[PDB]
Amino acid sequence: RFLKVKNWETDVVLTDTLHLKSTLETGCTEHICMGSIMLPTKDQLFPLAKEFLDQYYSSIKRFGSKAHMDRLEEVNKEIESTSTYQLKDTELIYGAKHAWRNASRCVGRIQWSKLQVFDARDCTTAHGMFNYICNHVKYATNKGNLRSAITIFPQRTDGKHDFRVWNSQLIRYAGYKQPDGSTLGDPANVQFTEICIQQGWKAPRGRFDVLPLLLQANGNDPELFQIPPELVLEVPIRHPKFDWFKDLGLKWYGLPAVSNMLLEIGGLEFSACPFSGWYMGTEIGVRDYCDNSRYNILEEVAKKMDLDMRKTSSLWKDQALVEINIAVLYSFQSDKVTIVDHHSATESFIKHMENEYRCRGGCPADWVWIVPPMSGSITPVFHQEMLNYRLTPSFEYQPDPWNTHVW
Amino acid sequence: RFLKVKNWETDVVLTDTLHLKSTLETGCTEHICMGSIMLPVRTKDQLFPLAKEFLDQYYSSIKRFGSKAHMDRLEEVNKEIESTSTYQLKDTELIYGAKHAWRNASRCVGRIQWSKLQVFDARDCTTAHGMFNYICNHVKYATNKGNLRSAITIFPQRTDGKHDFRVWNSQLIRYAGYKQPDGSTLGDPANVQFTEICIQQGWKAPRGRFDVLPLLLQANGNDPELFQIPPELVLEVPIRHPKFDWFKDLGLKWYGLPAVSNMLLEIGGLEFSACPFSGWYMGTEIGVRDYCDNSRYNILEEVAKKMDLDMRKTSSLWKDQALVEINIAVLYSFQSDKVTIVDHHSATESFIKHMENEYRCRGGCPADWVWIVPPMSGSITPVFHQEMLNYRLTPSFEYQPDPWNTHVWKG
Ligand code: HEM
Ligand code: HEM
Ligand SMILES: CCN(CCc1cccc(F)c1)Cc1cccc(NC(=N)c2cccs2)c1
Ligand SMILES: CCN(CCc1cccc(F)c1)Cc1cccc(NC(=N)c2cccs2)c1
Ligand SMILES: C[C@H](O)[C@H](O)[C@H]1CNc2nc(N)[nH]c(=O)c2N1
Ligand SMILES: C[C@H](O)[C@H](O)[C@H]1CNc2nc(N)[nH]c(=O)c2N1
Ligand SMILES: [Br-]
Ligand SMILES: [Br-]
Ligand SMILES: [Zn+2]
């Protein structure tokens, strides 16, 4: 019931008690581990509200105080009456910081307490959502010195009036199926690119077309908006040693901003909660650039390097991978856009886990996601045992809205 | 029930029913995943169901389920259990069991090979000198002058747990490790404790960087005894690089034959506590883990110094750069000397083909993603993108405590 995690590089053992507070289920049973699966009323809401307010009042050293008991009473009356309740600003901020803190797949959580929370609960239209979003993008981008931020749109009601950002990230590149049979641009976004086109976007049909926002307010039909080009910081990719690298024509955007997740706080559901931080270098150079189902540039790069591509055992893929990743980092650094390498981020996370074990009694962590997609065992996280479990407040996946929305 | 796994690179979806036959526990519950935890005297009444389940699996695999041979065998085992409290496997059933324990090993990327396993039956062994001779023969067979052949040697099973056969070595061939008074380590840091045991027992340590350890062999619950593997049987590969001519001067080498000797093999409820097994290396085992773990040979700094990379900031990726060169070196050296090795691209590609085959003929393939994904270049291997289901089937290889922690010394 009290659980130990061991670091096999350093022999440091930590004891986890925090898992006992865990509420949601994992996908696993005593018979089967699903650790590598990508995705496994009034009556319901009051318990969730109480659990939340209890931890909030605990966090501000006021557990069992007059004001604690009063608020529990207040929220209780409001659920009875209205079927829902509203969070105080302080609660909303706390809840959003804690959803990040609880994100077991997130290596960047040492930063969790510094999140800037933009309260957009007064938003009513898609044009309003667009304004809030542009403001978030400009604030977070900060001319290259990125700051973490979340923008929180109104909470779900009867669930026929959901706010949604149909985009998977605020800033992403279009993908277009070709006559040819190949894909132009990012193959991850073909379907959404098509949705934008059918809703009426005029696609320029290039390799790196920033997608328009498709914004849904109040369960209404979603609308298109272009993010002012001037607010989208992008980085041309060059290599500090290979002059030819630039001729690949590669670029990426500075601001990673997830917009398709659902934020749950005290039972309330925020279906539009775009959040942003900054990139770990491998996200772009290993996954975006080198996944076979993504930009898949490994072959072209290897060719420019004149490596022996005859045999897998020459490790030509591996050599090319390292160079691509060196270039991503050098390019961001040269243009002064915040980026972290996988060594520094994982070192940060081990230090963060130690803080959380010491200060909170644990840190839920998903090893499959935390270990970087290159050079795993040369980073400290590879050697660190992790316990994965689900705490609330939380960020959750939710169905893509086009499968759900009725026009 | 049916469970699906999806490959996120290919969209290939597979359906698992084999997990229904799983008996043993995982460590996980509905409230916690223990998937990255490294480690998450039997009665007659427990023994007969375990035997029956095993024998039913064996008779089904030879298409004789329910035959008179199957039924006579069950009754014969049942009678042996009630009167002697245990039972002996037939040679055929021992072969089937040892192969299946490999087939079932969820952390093994090399399982495409599982049905080609040379089984050496050492159940007539009685003494440590007996075990030495069996082990020498295994090494020489498996080594086969570089054309490595998978094999396992199976010593007598556990009886009362006071008469256990054990290889105290964690692998048959491994390098010594010496803690120096100044706190540095000479040789391999992973093997310090066991090296100290060997010295205590009388081994004369050459005290160098790659000294092959002596075997420490326990027969029949007796105190273990020391033996040196004939050097002429220990195939080694000097590590050089195809382009970097200074790489040889690092003084690196490694042995060709990886041979695990500290696991316990469970077949139909019976426990084989000494069951050394060998295959061949995937290159990353040596070039990533043995050479570059901070707690092992730890050569990254010295290699990157010699490549003259920028070592002032981790963001030059000097470690990742040095890591790749060392791994190229390991594979080049093994190939140049005609010693079997597999690269992590080949091995993971093979494993994915193995796993699809298994899903189709067997209804599943339990696999531990944390262990199957290689310790470098994870996502440019196909296994990174493959969902897997981890569950435990018997026959199985299981961990067991180090014998120096539990042995009752005779004197
Ligand atoms: C400040 C810099 C940050 C870094 C460097 C970072 C790093 C990462 C990385 C590399 C991933 C894996 C993503 C992937 O492979 O696709 C991730 C996952 C995640 N992070 Fe962060 N993170 C940061 C900030 C944030 C913030 C501000 C939030 C929310 C407030 C957040 C919540 C998440 C969540 C929820 C996941 C898991 C997503 C999923 O399961 O699909 N992180 N983090
Ligand atoms: C034939 C070539 C083989 C290759 C390339 C291979 C590859 C591997 C590798 C790379 C690992 C992970 C090792 C580590 O990180 O420590 C492994 C684990 C394992 N393999 Fe193999 N394997 C082979 C044959 C065998 C054989 C013959 C057996 C037994 C009959 C075996 C049973 C295992 C087991 C039980 C593990 C898990 C060990 C643990 O949990 O500590 N494999 N395999
Ligand atoms: C590339 C896709 N990432 C999610 C992966 C995913 C999600 C749902 C379904 C999938 F198939 C795959 C998006 C993501 C999520 C969290 C963090 C990041 N990377 C970042 N550095 C940040 C984004 C926002 C704050 S930090 C990317
Ligand atoms: C080096 C350590 N490996 C065990 C891992 C382990 C387990 C518990 C604690 C540890 F610190 C480390 C040994 C191992 C096991 C299985 C296979 C291999 N590698 C091989 N290629 C083979 C060995 C025998 C047949 S194939 C190595
Ligand atoms: C099937 C497997 O779970 C899947 O490929 C995962 C593995 N680990 C990951 N880790 C991170 N950070 N991001 C991912 O998209 C994935 N993909
Ligand atoms: C804590 C973590 O589970 C541990 O480092 C594991 C990770 N994956 C592994 N995978 C393999 N093949 N071998 C290992 O020793 C490990 N170590
Ligand atoms: Br970070
Ligand atoms: Br193989
Ligand atoms: Zn699990």
mmCIF file of C-alpha atoms in Angstrom, chain A residues 3-6 8-10 16 19 22-39 286-287 290-293 298 311-319 321-323 325-326 329-330 333 341-344 365 367-369 371-378 382-390, chain B residues 3-5 8-9 16 19 22-39 243 288-289 292-295 300 313-321 323-325 327-328 331-332 335 343-346 349 367 369-371 373-380 384-392:
data_model
loop_
_atom_site.group_PDB
_atom_site.id
_atom_site.type_symbol
_atom_site.label_atom_id
_atom_site.label_comp_id
_atom_site.label_asym_id
_atom_site.label_seq_id
_atom_site.Cartn_x
_atom_site.Cartn_y
_atom_site.Cartn_z
ATOM 1 C CA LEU A 3 5.100 1.777 -2.752
ATOM 2 C CA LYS A 4 8.809 2.101 -3.544
ATOM 3 C CA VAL A 5 10.399 3.379 -6.735
ATOM 4 C CA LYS A 6 14.062 2.793 -7.324
ATOM 5 C CA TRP A 8 18.795 1.857 -10.938
ATOM 6 C CA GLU A 9 21.592 4.290 -11.928
ATOM 7 C CA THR A 10 21.742 6.003 -8.499
ATOM 8 C CA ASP A 16 4.952 6.741 -2.894
ATOM 9 C CA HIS A 19 -1.223 7.022 -5.329
ATOM 10 C CA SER A 22 -5.904 8.243 -6.915
ATOM 11 C CA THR A 23 -9.490 8.181 -8.143
ATOM 12 C CA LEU A 24 -9.684 7.374 -11.902
ATOM 13 C CA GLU A 25 -8.780 3.881 -13.331
ATOM 14 C CA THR A 26 -5.654 2.961 -15.400
ATOM 15 C CA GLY A 27 -6.619 0.461 -18.067
ATOM 16 C CA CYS A 28 -4.510 -2.199 -16.286
ATOM 17 C CA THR A 29 -5.558 -5.214 -14.205
ATOM 18 C CA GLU A 30 -3.590 -7.744 -12.130
ATOM 19 C CA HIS A 31 -3.807 -9.995 -15.200
ATOM 20 C CA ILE A 32 -2.721 -7.535 -17.906
ATOM 21 C CA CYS A 33 -0.654 -4.347 -18.204
ATOM 22 C CA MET A 34 -1.886 -1.810 -20.758
ATOM 23 C CA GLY A 35 0.968 0.638 -20.152
ATOM 24 C CA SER A 36 1.772 0.976 -23.856
ATOM 25 C CA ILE A 37 -1.827 1.546 -25.145
ATOM 26 C CA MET A 38 -2.067 5.127 -26.435
ATOM 27 C CA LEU A 39 -5.666 5.605 -25.117
ATOM 28 C CA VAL A 286 12.804 13.014 -33.873
ATOM 29 C CA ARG A 287 8.983 12.736 -34.194
ATOM 30 C CA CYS A 290 11.526 11.522 -38.789
ATOM 31 C CA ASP A 291 8.404 9.466 -38.100
ATOM 32 C CA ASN A 292 7.666 7.509 -41.257
ATOM 33 C CA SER A 293 4.068 8.763 -41.057
ATOM 34 C CA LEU A 298 15.511 10.588 -42.801
ATOM 35 C CA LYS A 311 22.843 -1.847 -44.608
ATOM 36 C CA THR A 312 20.818 -0.999 -41.497
ATOM 37 C CA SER A 313 23.892 -1.965 -39.453
ATOM 38 C CA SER A 314 25.894 1.050 -40.671
ATOM 39 C CA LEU A 315 23.482 2.976 -38.392
ATOM 40 C CA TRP A 316 22.869 5.599 -41.149
ATOM 41 C CA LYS A 317 19.363 6.309 -39.768
ATOM 42 C CA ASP A 318 20.857 6.865 -36.339
ATOM 43 C CA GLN A 319 23.601 9.178 -37.619
ATOM 44 C CA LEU A 321 18.757 11.378 -36.634
ATOM 45 C CA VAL A 322 21.398 12.969 -34.384
ATOM 46 C CA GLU A 323 22.276 15.612 -37.009
ATOM 47 C CA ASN A 325 18.233 17.027 -33.871
ATOM 48 C CA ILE A 326 21.405 19.099 -33.554
ATOM 49 C CA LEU A 329 18.230 22.908 -31.371
ATOM 50 C CA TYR A 330 20.889 25.166 -33.001
ATOM 51 C CA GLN A 333 18.863 28.768 -30.019
ATOM 52 C CA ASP A 341 17.091 19.479 -25.202
ATOM 53 C CA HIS A 342 16.178 16.016 -23.960
ATOM 54 C CA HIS A 343 19.182 15.889 -21.555
ATOM 55 C CA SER A 344 18.242 19.079 -19.770
ATOM 56 C CA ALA A 365 4.629 9.420 -14.220
ATOM 57 C CA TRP A 367 7.589 5.983 -18.358
ATOM 58 C CA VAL A 368 6.584 5.116 -21.943
ATOM 59 C CA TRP A 369 5.970 8.867 -22.624
ATOM 60 C CA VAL A 371 11.677 8.655 -21.823
ATOM 61 C CA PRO A 372 12.650 10.655 -24.993
ATOM 62 C CA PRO A 373 12.308 8.988 -28.448
ATOM 63 C CA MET A 374 16.068 8.993 -29.011
ATOM 64 C CA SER A 375 19.034 8.086 -26.805
ATOM 65 C CA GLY A 376 16.720 6.769 -24.030
ATOM 66 C CA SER A 377 19.243 5.115 -21.636
ATOM 67 C CA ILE A 378 21.678 8.031 -21.786
ATOM 68 C CA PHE A 382 15.308 5.650 -18.476
ATOM 69 C CA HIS A 383 16.757 4.304 -15.231
ATOM 70 C CA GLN A 384 14.017 5.702 -13.001
ATOM 71 C CA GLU A 385 11.140 3.514 -11.905
ATOM 72 C CA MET A 386 7.840 5.371 -12.209
ATOM 73 C CA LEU A 387 4.361 4.729 -10.894
ATOM 74 C CA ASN A 388 1.522 5.717 -13.193
ATOM 75 C CA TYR A 389 -1.852 6.675 -11.755
ATOM 76 C CA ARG A 390 -4.588 9.190 -12.398
ATOM 77 C CA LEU B 3 -8.318 -7.013 -26.764
ATOM 78 C CA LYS B 4 -7.021 -4.818 -29.633
ATOM 79 C CA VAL B 5 -3.523 -3.354 -30.149
ATOM 80 C CA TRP B 8 0.379 3.914 -34.872
ATOM 81 C CA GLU B 9 2.805 4.017 -37.825
ATOM 82 C CA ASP B 16 -5.499 -10.692 -28.569
ATOM 83 C CA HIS B 19 -4.294 -13.131 -22.591
ATOM 84 C CA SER B 22 -2.685 -15.984 -18.499
ATOM 85 C CA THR B 23 -2.596 -17.092 -14.849
ATOM 86 C CA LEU B 24 0.182 -15.222 -12.919
ATOM 87 C CA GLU B 25 -0.181 -11.575 -11.604
ATOM 88 C CA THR B 26 1.393 -8.421 -13.200
ATOM 89 C CA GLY B 27 1.846 -5.982 -10.337
ATOM 90 C CA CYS B 28 -0.688 -3.593 -11.903
ATOM 91 C CA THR B 29 -4.244 -2.906 -10.694
ATOM 92 C CA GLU B 30 -7.122 -0.771 -12.002
ATOM 93 C CA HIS B 31 -5.644 2.066 -9.887
ATOM 94 C CA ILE B 32 -1.922 1.826 -10.617
ATOM 95 C CA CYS B 33 0.413 0.804 -13.446
ATOM 96 C CA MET B 34 3.652 -0.858 -12.427
ATOM 97 C CA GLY B 35 4.817 -1.242 -16.013
ATOM 98 C CA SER B 36 8.249 0.385 -15.364
ATOM 99 C CA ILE B 37 9.071 -1.436 -12.074
ATOM 100 C CA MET B 38 12.107 -3.637 -12.742
ATOM 101 C CA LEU B 39 11.046 -6.516 -10.403
ATOM 102 C CA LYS B 243 36.631 5.293 -39.857
ATOM 103 C CA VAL B 288 24.597 1.585 -25.389
ATOM 104 C CA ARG B 289 24.250 -0.168 -21.994
ATOM 105 C CA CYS B 292 27.720 3.995 -21.890
ATOM 106 C CA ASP B 293 25.574 3.585 -18.770
ATOM 107 C CA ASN B 294 27.105 5.948 -16.119
ATOM 108 C CA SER B 295 27.174 2.944 -13.742
ATOM 109 C CA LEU B 300 30.996 8.516 -23.427
ATOM 110 C CA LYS B 313 26.607 22.205 -23.534
ATOM 111 C CA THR B 314 24.441 19.088 -23.645
ATOM 112 C CA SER B 315 22.537 20.763 -26.525
ATOM 113 C CA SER B 316 25.352 20.109 -29.016
ATOM 114 C CA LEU B 317 24.194 16.456 -28.559
ATOM 115 C CA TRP B 318 27.798 15.366 -28.054
ATOM 116 C CA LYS B 319 26.647 12.339 -26.046
ATOM 117 C CA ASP B 320 24.167 11.241 -28.756
ATOM 118 C CA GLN B 321 26.922 11.708 -31.337
ATOM 119 C CA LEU B 323 26.778 7.056 -28.674
ATOM 120 C CA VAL B 324 26.118 6.395 -32.358
ATOM 121 C CA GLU B 325 29.841 6.069 -33.254
ATOM 122 C CA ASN B 327 27.460 1.434 -31.607
ATOM 123 C CA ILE B 328 28.731 1.494 -35.225
ATOM 124 C CA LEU B 331 28.571 -3.886 -34.937
ATOM 125 C CA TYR B 332 31.534 -3.360 -37.313
ATOM 126 C CA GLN B 335 30.760 -8.466 -38.278
ATOM 127 C CA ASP B 343 21.519 -4.433 -34.999
ATOM 128 C CA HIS B 344 18.483 -2.833 -33.320
ATOM 129 C CA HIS B 345 16.838 -2.021 -36.711
ATOM 130 C CA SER B 346 16.973 -5.639 -37.892
ATOM 131 C CA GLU B 349 11.771 -5.330 -37.577
ATOM 132 C CA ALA B 367 5.322 -8.067 -24.869
ATOM 133 C CA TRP B 369 7.223 -2.294 -24.337
ATOM 134 C CA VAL B 370 9.561 -0.771 -21.712
ATOM 135 C CA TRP B 371 12.046 -3.557 -22.432
ATOM 136 C CA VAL B 373 12.135 -0.643 -27.305
ATOM 137 C CA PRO B 374 15.960 -0.271 -27.726
ATOM 138 C CA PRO B 375 17.858 2.144 -25.413
ATOM 139 C CA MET B 376 18.818 4.367 -28.381
ATOM 140 C CA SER B 377 16.953 5.731 -31.382
ATOM 141 C CA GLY B 378 13.714 4.402 -29.894
ATOM 142 C CA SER B 379 11.184 6.005 -32.274
ATOM 143 C CA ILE B 380 13.015 5.170 -35.534
ATOM 144 C CA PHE B 384 8.192 2.231 -30.486
ATOM 145 C CA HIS B 385 4.986 2.735 -32.488
ATOM 146 C CA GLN B 386 3.520 -0.683 -31.620
ATOM 147 C CA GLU B 387 1.002 -1.096 -28.847
ATOM 148 C CA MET B 388 1.702 -4.208 -26.785
ATOM 149 C CA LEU B 389 -0.068 -6.181 -24.062
ATOM 150 C CA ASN B 390 1.994 -7.472 -21.167
ATOM 151 C CA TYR B 391 0.834 -10.609 -19.387
ATOM 152 C CA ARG B 392 2.400 -13.708 -17.944
#
